Design a protein around this nucleic acid. Structure first.
Ligand SMILES: [Zn+2]
Lengths: 170, 110, 131, 154, 194
RNA sequence: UGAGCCCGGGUCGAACGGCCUCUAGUGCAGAUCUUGGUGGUAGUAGCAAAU
RNA sequence: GGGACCGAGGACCGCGCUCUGCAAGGAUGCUGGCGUAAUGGUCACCAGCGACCCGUCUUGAAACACGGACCAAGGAGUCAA
RNA sequence: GAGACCGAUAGCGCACAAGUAGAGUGAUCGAAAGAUGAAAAGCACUUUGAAAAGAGGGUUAAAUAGCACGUGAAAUUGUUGAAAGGGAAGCGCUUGUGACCAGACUUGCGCCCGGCGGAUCAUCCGGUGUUCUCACCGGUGCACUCCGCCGGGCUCAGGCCAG
């Protein structure tokens, strides 16, 4: 580079660890109803849209049923259930657009005078609001077809007396 | 006295309603003590100077220009030593077109 | 890349000192370690429930020996010319101003250390800031 | 950081000292601890009662089993004595501190014993040895709380 | 006798040595590429040597020692000005230190690199210090600190603040600084003033 | 690892430290150790001797 | 297929393999969190488990026996031929 | 006249009232004990009271240096604060609670554009020292080159702990 190496800091050995794709579990199919276990949406019943790279999953609520927007979650932080809602009619092109990793990642007088203040909660973007609506409109129509599926996705998972998860099936 | 009024015409007609900004030194740990100094003077607000350890270091000249522009009358800087307040710097910003005025620096002992 | 040189993790086998036997009960015995020489001393015989003994197995890694938690090695400076000896070693060593260095000489050491890019462990001893 | 509890202002506190007093150290410690934290007029009347054998001071730490009586019921102790010289020397230092308060401008009816302390003096070089004592005490006024006014809305 | 000098330097005495307890020894000699005392970097025990130094005016030079000007200590060093462009100065080391030990070439390039880096750092510190306007002043001397600790106790005794506040407060009650019907005092005590 | 060593805070007032060598009256828990100082016993025994 | 502990080394070199590079002479990739406190120290105390008072001397050994109220300073293989 | 000696429990028993104090019929035996401060400037005066004592007030750079006097350890003791204590405490490993204290990466380089100033830039001129080919001054300017500086834009780089 620009600088001759000023110290004895040695370059590392060539590491032979190649990045191979993550194979998900057989249960994690698109349309599978998931149960969120951690985060601020713990105990919520969501649906899975697409399985992304390196152990993360693309997830929507839909937002008009339970209140979870288009979010990413970790696969290991999710209980997968047996109920699968049809994805027919859902725009795959919009799913591919929101699957791009930059979609979720991203001194003056004013700088000094907001120091120590809690920054105001940002109102939702108009692009994210419209992208939610273009996905859920066919999802919700498919959801309404199956009896009691809409109320099931609105409700929250909870453990009761005698519920043993090592024998319970989801 | 005629000599003192001429050298310092802003201090010596009536002063306006005061407004006080209190800050500490750079990366201060005397926030509770600086809030007690701000409670001493009415119409005083405390703003921390640095806002996290690796943030922008603001100079007292810059803060004086800032508080002058946003309608303050004086700036108080509370220097620290061994996590105890040690020096009180009083900067008179004054008003309108006259420059920022005298800077009286004291030492807090007990 | 403005930090210490890249080093292995600092691992210390023991953090507790090796207290001398019966130093808790007698005020004339200091806590500095003395090897017990009695043929029936329980510390010397290595019974359980007793004080441990220093051994070479407790010795620290050579790549991490004499190294502060920041990753720099302590270097006692006495004047400005001691600081300039760390021009080539600003990431391996840190400047420690001695307890016998006066106030104004600490000013010149602190000013030179910032220019050279070496850490100072005692940078706020006899000094204060002026606006 | 933490800040220690500051001393009461010297305009509110009167001090008095006694150094190298030829009284038993152990008798003074029990007599001073009896009158600690009291009003000055209580302490003076109590010490004149110990001289007049009417009231007794408790022996707690340096308690040689010399006197048990009904005068221990006031303290809950079974050991109570009548140190005459310890009361005489402590009266003379309370009256010194009351005089110091009067010269300073204090309210002599509201003095309390904020602090009192007995320390060992150098041993008198005569096989038999005496046990003299140093005594210090600080007399302060009772705390006066003024009424706070109602806050203004604005 | 280059080795015989080194044996005396390493194992008997050297006025430039600084022995630290941290597993390394330092050379205080100003004509050494690294601060460390070893066989490669001791300029006294190497008849052929190179060193990069920086002048007070800001110029970086390269110094050359040969076996011929060894008995003449005033003429030990050939001083060659190094270019301000970083690449031409690195090349100027390579042409001038040609057919030298590669330790000397490699450490002179490092010494050139650190000297330029410090100079850029020196200009960034001075620009920020000028903007900040803050300087480190020494704290109080222990004689002065004991002086005003002694005179503050005497001034606090002389001040008698609580009686001074009381005297001033009742003084402003008399002159009518609070006006007729004062909000500071209750009415039946204001009647006692007149 | 350790014997130990460095720094901070307070006190304090006139000299001291690192390296390499030389030197020795050179490292303490014991010796019913020596000298000094100080405890519990104990405000106890008892007011004998001494003071 | 499920779980745990571990990542020593630091340009290339060697043996190989499924050969446009690989799991082949030792962990990389991605994401997040961290300064009115991430993380430590010392003290006091609680808790589980552990754990005879040191030295000397006798003896196969324990057990006796001698010394130890406490602290500071001194204190014992030296120098000559 | 000196010292690779000792530095007030040491060095002569004696740094000072030391063969003194003191003991023994007597011959003889024989100690302990140095340091205010640069200078007494050794606390005038007011005020408790019987004292080798205080509270004010003053001297001094300093009186927590006041003829108990440089520094002022430990044993031992008082006050204040915190915690604990059902016939031992103390100690080892490992948490936890509370109190106090500390503060983690020094937290940066490289490109692009425009302006400005310098030179180690001109086959520019004069001078000085020199290892005799290298340095350092002074005056020229900005065709080229290279440094900085200011105002933008951009890049990557990083310390610890997790998933
Ligand atoms: Zn060397």
């Amino acid at each position: 580079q620009k600088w001759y190496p000023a110290e004895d800091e040695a370059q590392p050995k060539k590491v032979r660890k190649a990045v191979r794709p993550w194979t998900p579990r057989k249960s994690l199919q698109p349309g599978t109803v998931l149960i969120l276990l951690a985060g601020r949406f713990r105990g919520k019943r969501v649906v899975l849209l697409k399985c992304l790279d390196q152990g993360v999953l693309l997830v929507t609520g839909p937002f008009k049923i339970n209140g979870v927007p288009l979010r990413r979650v970790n696969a290991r932080y999710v209980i997968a259930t047996s109920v699968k809602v049809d994805l027919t009619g859902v725009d795959q092109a919009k799913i591919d657009e929101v699957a791009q990793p930059k979609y979720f990642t991203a001194a003056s007088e004013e700088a000094f005078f907001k120091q120590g203040e809690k920054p105001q909660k940002k109102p939702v973007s108009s692009t994210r609001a419209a992208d939610q609506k273009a996905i859920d409109k066919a999802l919700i129509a498919n959801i309404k077809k199956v009896d009691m599926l809409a109320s099931y996705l609105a409700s929250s998972f909870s453990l009761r007396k005698g519920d043993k998860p090592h024998l319970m099936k989801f | 006295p005629d000599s003192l009024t001429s050298q310092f015409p802003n201090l010596f007609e009536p002063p306006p309603v005061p407004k006080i900004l209190v800050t500490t030194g750079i990366n201060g740990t005397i926030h509770k003590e600086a809030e007690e100094i701000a409670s001493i003077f009415p119409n005083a607000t405390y703003i921390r100077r640095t806002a996290h350890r690796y943030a922008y270091k603001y100079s007292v000249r810059e803060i004086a220009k800032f508080a002058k522009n946003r309608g303050y009358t004086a700036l108080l800087v509370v220097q620290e030593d061994q996590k105890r307040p040690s020096r009180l710097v009083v900067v008179h910003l004054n008003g309108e077109g006259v420059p920022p005025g005298p800077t009286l620096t004291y030492t807090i002992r007990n | 890349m403005v930090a210490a040189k890249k080093h292995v993790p600092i691992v210390k086998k023991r953090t507790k000192r090796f207290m001398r036997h019966q130093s808790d009960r007698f005020k004339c015995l200091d806590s500095a370690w003395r090897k017990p020489k009695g043929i029936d001393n329980r510390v010397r015989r290595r019974f359980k429930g007793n004080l441990a003994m220093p051994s070479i197995g407790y010795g620290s890694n050579k790549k991490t020996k004499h190294m502060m938690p920041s990753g720099h090695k302590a270097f006692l400076v006495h004047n400005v010319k001691d600081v300039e000896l760390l021009l080539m070693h600003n990431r391996t060593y840190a400047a420690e101003i001695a307890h016998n260095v006066s106030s104004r000489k600490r000013i010149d050491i602190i000013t030179r250390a910032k220019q050279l890019g070496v850490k100072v462990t005692n940078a706020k001893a006899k000094v204060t800031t002026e606006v | 950081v933490r800040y220690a509890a500051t001393e009461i202002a010297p305009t509110k506190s009167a001090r008095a000292r006694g150094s190298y007093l030829r009284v038993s150290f152990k008798n003074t410690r029990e007599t001073a601890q009896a009158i600690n934290g009291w009003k000055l007029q209580r302490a003076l009347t109590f010490l004149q009662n110990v001289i007049d054998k009417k009231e007794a001071v408790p022996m707690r730490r340096y308690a040689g089993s010399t006197g048990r009586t009904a005068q221990g019921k006031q303290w809950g102790v079974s050991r109570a004595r009548w140190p005459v010289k310890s009361a005489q020397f402590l009266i003379g230092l309370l009256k010194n501190a009351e005089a110091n308060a009067d010269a300073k401008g204090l309210d002599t009816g509201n003095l309390i014993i904020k602090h009192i302390q007995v320390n060992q003096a150098p041993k008198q070089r005569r096989p038999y040895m005496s046990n003299p004592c140093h005594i210090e005490l600080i007399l302060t006024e009772a705390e006066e709380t003024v009424q706070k006014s109602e806050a203004v809305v604005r | 006798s280059d080795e015989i000098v080194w044996q005396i330097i390493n194992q008997q005495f050297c006025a430039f040595k600084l022995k630290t307890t941290k597993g390394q020894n330092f050379c205080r000699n100003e004509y050494s590429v690294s601060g460390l005392c070893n066989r490669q970097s001791c300029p006294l025990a190497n008849s052929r040597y190179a060193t990069v130094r920086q002048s007070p005016k800001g110029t970086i030079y390269l110094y050359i020692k040969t076996i011929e000007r060894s008995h003449m200590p005033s003429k030990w060093w050939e001083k060659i000005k190094l270019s301000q462009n970083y690449q031409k100065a690195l090349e100027q080391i390579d042409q001038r230190l040609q057919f030298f030990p590669k330790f000397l070439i490699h450490k002179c390039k490092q010494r050139l690199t650190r000297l330029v880096q410090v100079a850029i750092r020196m200009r960034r510190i001075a620009a920020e210090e000028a903007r900040l306007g803050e300087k480190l002043v020494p704290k109080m001397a222990p004689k002065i600190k004991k002086r005003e600790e002694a005179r503050e106790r005497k001034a606090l005794a002389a001040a008698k603040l609580e009686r001074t506040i009381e005297r001033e407060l009742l003084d402003r009650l008399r002159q009518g600084a609070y006006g007729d019907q004062p909000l500071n005092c209750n009415p039946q005590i204001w009647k006692k003033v007149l």
